[PDB]
Amino acid sequence: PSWPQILGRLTDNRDLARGQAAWAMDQIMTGNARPAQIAAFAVAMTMKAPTADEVGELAGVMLSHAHPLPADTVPDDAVDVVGTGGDGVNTVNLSTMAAIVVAAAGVPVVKHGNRAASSLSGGADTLEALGVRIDLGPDLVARSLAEVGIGFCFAPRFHPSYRHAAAVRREIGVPTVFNLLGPLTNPARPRAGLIGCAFADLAEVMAGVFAARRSSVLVVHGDDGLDELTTTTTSTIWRVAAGSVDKLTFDPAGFGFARAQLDQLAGGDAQANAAAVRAVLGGARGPVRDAVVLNAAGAIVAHAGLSSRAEWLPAWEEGLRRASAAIDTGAAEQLLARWVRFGRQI
Amino acid sequence: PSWPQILGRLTDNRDLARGQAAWAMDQIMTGNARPAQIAAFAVAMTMKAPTADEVGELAGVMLSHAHPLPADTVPDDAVDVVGTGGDGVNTVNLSTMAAIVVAAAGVPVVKHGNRAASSLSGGADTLEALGVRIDLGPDLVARSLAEVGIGFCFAPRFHPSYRHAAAVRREIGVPTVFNLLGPLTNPARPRAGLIGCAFADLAEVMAGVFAARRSSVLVVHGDDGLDELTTTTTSTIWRVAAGSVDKLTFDPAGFGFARAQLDQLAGGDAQANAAAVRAVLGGARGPVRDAVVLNAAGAIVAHAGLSSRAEWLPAWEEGLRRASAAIDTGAAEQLLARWVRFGRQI
Ligand SMILES: O=P(O)(O)OC[C@H]1O[C@H](OP(=O)(O)OP(=O)(O)O)[C@H](O)[C@@H]1O
Ligand SMILES: O=P(O)(O)OC[C@H]1O[C@H](OP(=O)(O)OP(=O)(O)O)[C@H](O)[C@@H]1O
Ligand SMILES: O=C(O)c1ccccc1Cc1ccccc1
Ligand SMILES: O=C(O)c1ccccc1Cc1ccccc1
Ligand SMILES: O=C(O)c1ccccc1Cc1ccccc1
Ligand SMILES: [Mg+2]
Ligand SMILES: [Mg+2]
Numbered sequence: 095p096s097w098p099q100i101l102g103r104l105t106d107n108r109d110l111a112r113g114q115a116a117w118a119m120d121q122i123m124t125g126n127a128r129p130a131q132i133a134a135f136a137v138a139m140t141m142k143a144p145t146a147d148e149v150g151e152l153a154g155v156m157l158s159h160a161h162p163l164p165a166d167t168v169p170d171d172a173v174d175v176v177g178t179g180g181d182g183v184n185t186v187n188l189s190t191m192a193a194i195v196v197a198a199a200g201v202p203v204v205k206h207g208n209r210a211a212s213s214l215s216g217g218a219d220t221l222e223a224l225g226v227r228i229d230l231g232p233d234l235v236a237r238s239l240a241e242v243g244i245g246f247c248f249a250p251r252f253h254p255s256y257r258h259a260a261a262v263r264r265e266i267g268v269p270t271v272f273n274l275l276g277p278l279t280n281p282a283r284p285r286a287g288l289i290g291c292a293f294a295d296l297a298e299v300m301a302g303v304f305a306a307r308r309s310s311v312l313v314v315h316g317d318d319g320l321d322e323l324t325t326t327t328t329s330t331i332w333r334v335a336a337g338s339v340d341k342l343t344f345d346p347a348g349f350g351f352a353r354a355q356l357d358q359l360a361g362g363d364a365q366a367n368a369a370a371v372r373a374v375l376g377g378a379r380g381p382v383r384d385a386v387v388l389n390a391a392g393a394i395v396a397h398a399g400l401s402s403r404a405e406w407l408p409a410w411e412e413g414l415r416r417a418s419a420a421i422d423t424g425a426a427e428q429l430l431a432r433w434v435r436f437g438r439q440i
Numbered sequence: 441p442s443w444p445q446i447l448g449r450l451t452d453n454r455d456l457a458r459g460q461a462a463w464a465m466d467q468i469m470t471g472n473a474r475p476a477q478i479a480a481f482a483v484a485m486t487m488k489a490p491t492a493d494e495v496g497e498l499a500g501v502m503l504s505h506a507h508p509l510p511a512d513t514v515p516d517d518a519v520d521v522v523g524t525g526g527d528g529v530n531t532v533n534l535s536t537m538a539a540i541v542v543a544a545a546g547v548p549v550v551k552h553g554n555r556a557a558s559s560l561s562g563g564a565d566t567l568e569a570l571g572v573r574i575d576l577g578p579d580l581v582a583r584s585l586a587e588v589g590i591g592f593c594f595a596p597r598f599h600p601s602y603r604h605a606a607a608v609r610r611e612i613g614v615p616t617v618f619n620l621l622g623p624l625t626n627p628a629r630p631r632a633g634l635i636g637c638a639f640a641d642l643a644e645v646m647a648g649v650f651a652a653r654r655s656s657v658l659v660v661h662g663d664d665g666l667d668e669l670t671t672t673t674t675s676t677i678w679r680v681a682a683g684s685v686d687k688l689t690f691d692p693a694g695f696g697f698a699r700a701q702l703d704q705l706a707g708g709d710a711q712a713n714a715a716a717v718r719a720v721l722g723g724a725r726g727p728v729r730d731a732v733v734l735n736a737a738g739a740i741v742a743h744a745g746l747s748s749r750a751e752w753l754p755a756w757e758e759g760l761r762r763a764s765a766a767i768d769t770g771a772a773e774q775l776l777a778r779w780v781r782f783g784r785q786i
């Protein structure tokens with residue numbers, strides 16, 4: 095294997111041979127690839143049209159190098175709620191708020207996240223401004239999970255060897271296949287998730303990766319471009335279950351949600367976004383709450399999918415009940431307070 | 441303009457807006473572009489499908505930054521004989537030998553060239569092994585042209601600001617749009633040329649660039665893969681005249697040439713390739729001579745094409761007569777000896 099061989103194949107517009115994507119990603123992760131090689135690979139792979147086998151190879155290599163959580167500290171039914179980012183909107187941190195509510199409903203959550211790349215505040219930025227410790231290592235994330243019901247795996251802490259790819263990602267600024275890897279490389283390897291993808295023609299490939307892993311996942315793209323289930327219009331859902339994918343259109347109005355306008359979901363810096371989380375968890379009614387509940391419900395449906403029994407329309411109704419209730423009872427607000435406290439008691 | 445804007449447009453598979461390619465090449469030529477951005481641009485441009493406008497912009501920027509020859513030192517009808525390289529075949533130096541014969545026929549030759557990038561011995565390597573000064577500056581190239589009838593512009597000597605792009609080209613190893621630039625950026629800007637292209641899919645774009653400039657050029661690709669007019673089979677020629685491109689297939693059997701096998705054109709290191717130059721210039725008959733006479737005749741046909749009155753078959757017959765006579769009379773052999781002396785004598 096070599097860069098000339100692998101890059102030549104992608105520029106010739108051919109799928110890679112088995113193991114070639116893995117070889118390249120491993121070269122990148124061990125500090126053996128030049129920035130020019132990283133960049134050419136990321137770009138060539140994107141314009142060829144990456145396959146699920148290829149992206150799955152990249153994610154596998156990352157996960158090989160990642161710091162794992164201690165043996166037996168992650169429940170079999172843990173869920174993630176996370177997206178690619180890069181939708182270019184300023185939204186409040188919808189995946190993060192949704193994650194808190196899901197954990198409050200009693201579904202164990204191990205969230206993978208990161209600071210903003212192009213938006214004003216990312217999930218990690220907002221959690222830090224809420225006073226949550228984003229910087230915890232594996233042992234402490236396990237304890238957070240067990241003690242609070244939610245853990246946060248901060249991407250740079252668990253994937254230090256991604257530094258070179260990350261620098262290339264920043265320098266080129268254009269989204270590539272690398273922008274898919276975050277939701278695919280949660281170091282705790284939870285088996286279910288609500289997974290947002292900003293790139294309409296890469297979502298199916300993401301779903302394919304999860305299918306191969308036999309995860310129960312909803313990969314979601316809002317038809318307004320949000321890497322979240324949206325309230326402004328319909329969303330496309332790639333439903334992953336029993337190792338297979340099917341594409342659905344999802345209509346929040348079908349459940350009773352008023353249509354919102356994207357400016358109603360608008361964000362600010364980390365201080366503003368933190369105040370939006372507090373408002374939502376404090377019971378403020380309106381568009382932010384609606385989108386949070388929808389997205390929490392979606393994650394609860396992915397969790398339910400870890401069973402044969404799981405049935406689409408009933409799963410949603412129950413997910414929506416549970417998400418609403420976790421906020422209404424104050425369970426979500428109290429969980430956030432307990433999470434903040436946990437991090438202060440070292 | 442920005443890298444995110446330009447790279448995004450290319451990865452969306454869209455042609456650039458006018459001036460975007462020029463902006464990017466200029467960033468690259470002024471040391472303002474990171475290796476990652478250079479590589480991402482070269483790759484995305486190649487996979488999109490570069491246009492003649494875009495490639496012409498790259499070449500125009502390179503020519504803007506190149507060392508020029510002094511005013512009024514390059515005759516109106518100077519010719520180049522040069523290819524992309526990158527054919528992955530190990531040939532004797534056909535363009536270089538052709539160039540010497542063409543000069544000896546009395547057509548002024550200002551050759552752009554470079555050391556090998558992936559073959560054993562490139563034009564510049566072989567010229568160096570023959571005792572020719574390859575790295576003369578603008579003023580001495582002009583004097584060489586006036587006194588010997590041929591000058592050689594060494595690419596690193598005339599395009600110092602391409603240094604960063606060149607390092608990226610070698611690091612990625614795969615051919616890109618950058619590989620087209622050599623034959624398109626001769627600093628003496630001759631108006632005619634026999635131009636070899638190893639990349640069948642890009643040769644038409646090279647021809648378009650020459651058409652825009654109103655050059656009289658034959659862009660050639662041997663149907664065996666050579667960036668030269670081959671003697672082993674037919675060649676595709678994109679004939680450039682009166683600012684238009686005509687695609688032709690050319691068969692040397694039409695002029696009485698015997699088919700050769702590719703192994704008969706096989707080269708070696710610079711010493712072996714230098715000895716093959718002397719053997720051809722000394723009158724040795726065989727396949728190598730045939731390939732040199734054919735390519736010389738091709739450069740002479742491109743030269744004739746600077747006149748609107750030139751006709752194709754008579755131009756070929758005259759080109760072949762002139763190329764053959766230049767060897768047989770000893771004029772090509774003497775010209776090489778004079779070139780060597782010129783470099784030794786200041
Ligand atoms: O700056 P951007 O490239 O637009 O990225 C926006 C955020 O989306 C992703 O996280 P996540 O889905 O966990 O965050 P959320 O709470 O903002 O939805 C990513 O980790 C960023 O934090
Ligand atoms: O290492 P490669 O990428 O295969 O390139 C082989 C040579 O071809 C080009 O020159 P030119 O056409 O002037 O050389 P020639 O005499 O060998 O035909 C290029 O400048 C190299 O010198
Ligand atoms: O540059 C990335 O995509 C990336 C790749 C591998 C690991 C982590 C990230 C950061 C991230 C985490 C979670 C969501 C989005 C982005
Ligand atoms: O290396 C350089 O500094 C350089 C600068 C300007 C022109 C040519 C080259 C050399 C080169 C060798 C092989 C491929 C491409 C380029
Ligand atoms: O090939 C390149 O990267 C290149 C680009 C711009 C200028 C010069 C070269 C080197 C060259 C000169 C002549 C023929 C082939 C190659
Ligand atoms: Mg999100
Ligand atoms: Mg989002």
Ligand SMILES: [Mg+2]
Nearest residue numbers: 522523535636
């Ligand atoms: Mg050549």
Ligand SMILES: [Mg+2]
Nearest residue numbers: 523525667668
């Ligand atoms: Mg050649």
